[PDB]
Amino acid sequence: QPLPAALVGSHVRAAAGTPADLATDRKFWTGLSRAVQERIADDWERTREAYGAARQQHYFSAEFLMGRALLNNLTNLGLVDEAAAATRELGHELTDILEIENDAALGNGGLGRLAACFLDSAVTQDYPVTGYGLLYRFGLFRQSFNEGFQVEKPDPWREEEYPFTIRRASDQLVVCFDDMKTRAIPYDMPITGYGTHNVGTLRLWKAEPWEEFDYDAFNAQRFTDAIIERERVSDICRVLYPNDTTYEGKKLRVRQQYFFTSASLQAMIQDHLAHHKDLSNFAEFHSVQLNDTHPVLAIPELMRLLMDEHDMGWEESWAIVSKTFAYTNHTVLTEALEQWDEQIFQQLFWRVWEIIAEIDRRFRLERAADGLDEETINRMAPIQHGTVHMAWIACYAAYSINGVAALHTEIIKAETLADWYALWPEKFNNKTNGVTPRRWLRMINPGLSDLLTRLSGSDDWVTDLDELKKLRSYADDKSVLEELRAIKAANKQDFAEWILERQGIEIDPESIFDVQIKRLHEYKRQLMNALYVLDLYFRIKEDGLTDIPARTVIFGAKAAPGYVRAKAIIKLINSIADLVNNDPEVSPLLKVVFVENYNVSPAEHILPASDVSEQISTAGKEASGTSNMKFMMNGALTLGTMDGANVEIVDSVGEENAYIFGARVEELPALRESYKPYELYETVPGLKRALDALDNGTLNDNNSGLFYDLKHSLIHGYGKDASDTYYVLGDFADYRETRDRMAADYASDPLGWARMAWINICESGRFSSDRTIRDYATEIWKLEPTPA
Amino acid sequence: PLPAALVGSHVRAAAGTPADLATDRKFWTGLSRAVQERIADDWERTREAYGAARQQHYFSAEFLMGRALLNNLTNLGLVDEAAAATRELGHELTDILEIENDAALGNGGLGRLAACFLDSAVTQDYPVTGYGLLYRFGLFRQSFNEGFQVEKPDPWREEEYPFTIRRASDQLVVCFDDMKTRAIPYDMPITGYGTHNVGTLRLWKAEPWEEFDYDAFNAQRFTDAIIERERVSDICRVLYPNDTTYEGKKLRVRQQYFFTSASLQAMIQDHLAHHKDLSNFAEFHSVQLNDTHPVLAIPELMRLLMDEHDMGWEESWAIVSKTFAYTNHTVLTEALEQWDEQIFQQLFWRVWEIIAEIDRRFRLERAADGLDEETINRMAPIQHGTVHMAWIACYAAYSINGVAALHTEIIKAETLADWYALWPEKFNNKTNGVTPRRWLRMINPGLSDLLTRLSGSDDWVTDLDELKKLRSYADDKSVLEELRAIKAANKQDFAEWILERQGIEIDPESIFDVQIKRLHEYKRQLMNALYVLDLYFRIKEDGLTDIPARTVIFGAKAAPGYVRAKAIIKLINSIADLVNNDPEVSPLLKVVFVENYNVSPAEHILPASDVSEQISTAGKEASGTSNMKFMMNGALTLGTMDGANVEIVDSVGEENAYIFGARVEELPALRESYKPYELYETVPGLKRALDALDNGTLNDNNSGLFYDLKHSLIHGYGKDASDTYYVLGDFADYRETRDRMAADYASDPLGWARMAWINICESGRFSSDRTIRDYATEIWKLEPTPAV
Ligand SMILES: *Cc1c(COP(=O)(O)O)cnc(C)c1O
């Protein structure tokens, strides 16, 4: 029987050393998860054999924002009810058990969450795709709050038994740096799939020292000396995205990237020679996707392995490399385009450096023969001015270079990677981002899932979201609209319970849930959102505004540790919350909620209850926007600029089913040219009272002086050099106009609102990562569905 | 049952692959989980039963636990079932058993005694719980490089270890003045043959309050970020960490305080859940202090009672004096712990105040008692800024015991004469013993079968005295025949074991002459080696040929900084090379140095042993637990009249053992006029042997170590001779006796078997079941408490 109490009890007893009913919630979670592993073990192996005989894809990424695994696995295996039954039968409540698990701290943001959605979409379609990354022990950082200020701490997640990562020490490899010999210990994480028996794999690497510690130093009682090398190796997997302002920090970033790409390629080669005679046909059977530039060292490293360990010539090796790697670009701008001092490579791995230098030497000669001028070659070369340009190695080696949305792909063709598109137009293509309908709809919004399943006649939509388009006809069915309003309300009722229990705040389950969950960045304009709230505070308390629906403004963000104004903005939001939440004359109509330590789990609780999706980055700064897509699938309406994902959302539902505003990306150069923010400060009604509220003592920054800095970052200067880089004051008037209008349509036309929401839901199939993966798989990787 | 279906379930969960495809490591893991699942209920029942009873809490800085799987399977009577299930699932049990590293939780005899005690306690249903540290890397792993001992870390739980269960939710705090630490409790099950009771070894793991200094990490001060994390980790990193410097000493004291404080806090917690308060703590609890390592428990309990539970000093000390019992193990007072009081003042000021108050009160109480200032100063816990831990123990303990009749008389008369004169009622004797489960029933199934067949039941397994009535078969050739066949099979097993372990080929028909002791000069491995070198020349040059072939086996680790001991190990490896590689001698004589001697190696050696070398200088050994293990397995004792050999010969008679050398009462006169140089020139063949040490026969690698050894033997006169342990003085009698013993082995095989049989049948005297029964009724005052 599927997940009987007897089986679950057995695994729990083994973990707790006590009968299953007396076990702690922690030990029960461990037992239950072991039960799941037991049940898929067979399928997992069959999948391994199936994929092993097929052409494969290997997705390299410096991050995988996996979130929790238990509910997701139970859902995809269709065992939630049995688990519920088994657990209660053994004296526990499944809802409590699920809370035991911390989000796997293996990723940071969108880049990582995309890689995660891709893995789920791949197995759901039986595509032989294996993921490869680092087993970060403490994630990015855990966010807490002290007196309203963000505090960063380690983010452990696997300090306790974690059955969803299996250690394979007997399969360990060596990654030797010129100054450090390391063990690379492989871990296996199972990727389950709704509606299939296939179980994919996410391979995570953990660095361990050659020797546990320096016993001689220890025995001499030089205790710190004894563990320095141990902890320097441990630093490779300690945290994600370690700060790199110093040389040593930069060298660690490069260590991290070489570590998991070298280990991954070695294991891939191992596996290949266990299924094939030699490597000469490596590229027929393997492709590797480079998610951004983090994994680009894989390229010189595959050359090294092929030539140094399998006696292959340069020409044959490069031929394999140029047919193996594909490369995904994520932003419109150079900027973040990784660049490393060549000296780091020379010091960490001299042989790999020689290969990088040979790549650059050959590249220049090949270009000169192509007939290019020296100025163009110099600015394309992988090595220039003592610096190695990782994106140029990627563009040179990759057989495919893709953007992640129609507009973004065109910019990289025309600007960012213009010289590359000029030489090799054929490499460029587009692959629009998307999210997985499983975790972000079916798993988190059963209420909505039910209705979709009743209407459409099956749950085929779970793995083929386009099926929902068929339901746009009901947009006029009033009984259905009412059901959808009731689903949203039930979700909001749930959210209020969750937030009350989590942070002790009481909110109105009937108010509008206006949500902005995004990394804190000035170009994200959480600050603009904050202003609007502050102004609205004053329009209610001093201006007598009352003909408006109550609303709860929800925030979720981390700020980078050294990003001063980002942390100041988070502090500002917390102070504004304190002001409006404790003012009886305003709390009835406006409350602010800052969700602490925003991550996958919090997102799962927020999205289903969301009404308004704030996507207000400055036009031209967002290439994509996957959270935008998740909101759409859950019945939340988009309030945003004509940038990134909003473009495609509006394109699908129409201007009438969304709230777009602000300057367009083509208008801004002229606006910034003669920008007069200080005048807006003095002129735009309310704005002066709003911004002054930052340093007249209305708000409290606890003597930090942060609010006054923010204020003058917005009003100081003028023209293209104005301090308000992200046109916050410039768009505020149009932003407030639209946000106000949106809240109005909300109190006055409930059915009309529910209708727009339905249109969004039914058209959201366009943003499913299943379509994205199909496209990667058919156009770039050239894969076939491979059932186990 | 332990059915294949159950084991496969647990293996699949651990391996993420069908059981038959799992690696041996994963299979071992799953099989161990299967065992835990099976005893979980009996374990909880024992917890409840012991908790309602008067209990004993055994405090020890070491527990030499060895491997747990085979021991548990044997005590649960599931070896046959486990063997079949494993084979049914594609694996072989022996291969699986070999995967487990000995749990590096102990050092030597002191730790093994604590382990045997835990087993004997559960076998008799006595409510005894063990408390220690969860050492992560043991003492050290021994390896060899060009004949020299090399020391490295000894990991054992880097891989999942299902036999230690983490209880993070029950964690406590141990605050040092310079370090707030988390005390994570771990539970290890102690199974018992013939009973359903399952005892507990509680092991504590120190973890940092914060994972690491995130602020320093972000600043890219990578070493600074983990200094404090690793200082806390040092608490459980290594056992008996070198303490030649103040810092090493402070670490030892930190380790002792950590596990005592945590244990007492947990004991108090548990007491307050069965009783209204701590006024009757001593009525329901007893704490055995195994040597002086856990003495800080005394002041710490005082601190807890007064500082956390509002008791006054008088009441608190009353409880303490009826709670603690102290066990003394040696005849010398130079090993008794003494610490600079500054260490205490720095680690825990409050605890130091209490220790000072203990000294202050002690002096006044003894002055009241009428002792003179001289005696008081010499008994005080604090003298000249040094805290004498043994004095705190003798002052607080209600019981002070020795570990052998003679040893106990010596400490009454000498070692602790001041305390015996003051409180004669505290002193008593509890002779050490070993468990017949791990050391006979589990490792020698061949002999166990014969014993069970002859006696008609396996009652002897938990009542070894039962074998006495079998002594009469000493004259039955059918039995002796079986005895010899069993030894022969055991030796063949060992020969296979060593061949696979170190590639050395040995003759299963030769005499297995074994010495497995820690390397100490008083242990006299050197005399053994001298005899081997001489024998080499006798065979090579003196035409010796009327002798049986023999394999001389050594097992021994040397303390890292002990130069003579390490020189001796090198010498043994040198002689072995000289001997094993000479075609004129190898066929008769081979030397085997078993690398990294520990519990598992002993378990393979003992059953195959013919000769038990117990040759320490008379007067040096108080006990001799290894001596007992050899006896139980049919090996004859070649040793001095000292320690366990006395009692052994007392039980079997001088005709069934080979005692030699100077008795302890003769040595004072012998040494007074000791002339090692004369012996060097006169004992036949000796000069040739010793000269081989520096004439080029044996290679020092030009270290001059052999020369120093040679000189340490032949230099000086009388009380100032360098041969402090009468190595040359005993050599003549040693060689004669050892030569005689070999002659008997080959001339009277059945007579040899007879002697072996009498040893085996009389071994019940050394069962730790008798030792524990005596602790429990005379000191701890326990009653058998069955779980079911
Ligand atoms: C979906 C998701 C993201 C991506 O969000 P964007 O800001 O739209 O790039 C990041 N973090 C979490 C927790 C998410 O679930």
Ligand SMILES: *Cc1c(COP(=O)(O)O)cnc(C)c1O
């Ligand atoms: C039994 C045992 C001991 C104790 O023996 P000694 O005679 O005191 O040296 C120490 N170590 C191991 C591995 C043992 O099994």
